[PDB]
Symmetry: C2
């Protein structure tokens, strides 16, 4: 029961995906300031996992809300050490 | 109230256990829900520090298990997946 949101739970050699947007960086798309998934590498965990899609809004990383976070700080959470990476994502149909 | 848990399935087997569900004995006298009933300490659930004995398992890998059968929830856990994502209630 997560509503219009969904969870990506990836096993942690590189992320396998990139993000764009947030505070301190250029926006992902004109008219929006939030963090979004901006690329998914082929063969990477994210790609084959099929739970990531470019354009997803990144709401939280490893339980840390980033709807108001800086770009490079959201990227630090992603590169920070843990066996997994949890993403709370919100998608547009 | 609601938490997300993301665990890497370790080759030793994942630590936590569950109890309850529509076709088993409850974990808690008057509740038909699915709860994590034990945590093998050392395992992934314990190392992540995100599971708790007593947590109500709401959903498993996007599948709602608030109304499900004990048999089905274990099936969701048992499935050989690289990860397991849990949505818990409390702790």
């Amino acid at each position: 029961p997560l509503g219009s949101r969904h969870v990506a739970c990836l096993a942690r050699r590189g992320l396998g995906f990139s993000i764009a947007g947030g505070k301190g960086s250029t926006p992902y798309r004109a008219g929006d300031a939030g963090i979004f998934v901006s690329r998914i590498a082929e063969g990477g965990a994210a790609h084959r996992a099929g739970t990531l899609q470019v354009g997803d809004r990144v709401l939280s990383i490893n339980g840390v809300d980033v709807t108001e976070a800086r770009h490079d700080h959201a990227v630090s959470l992603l590169t920070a050490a843990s066996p997994t990476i949890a993403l709370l994502l919100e998608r547009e149909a």
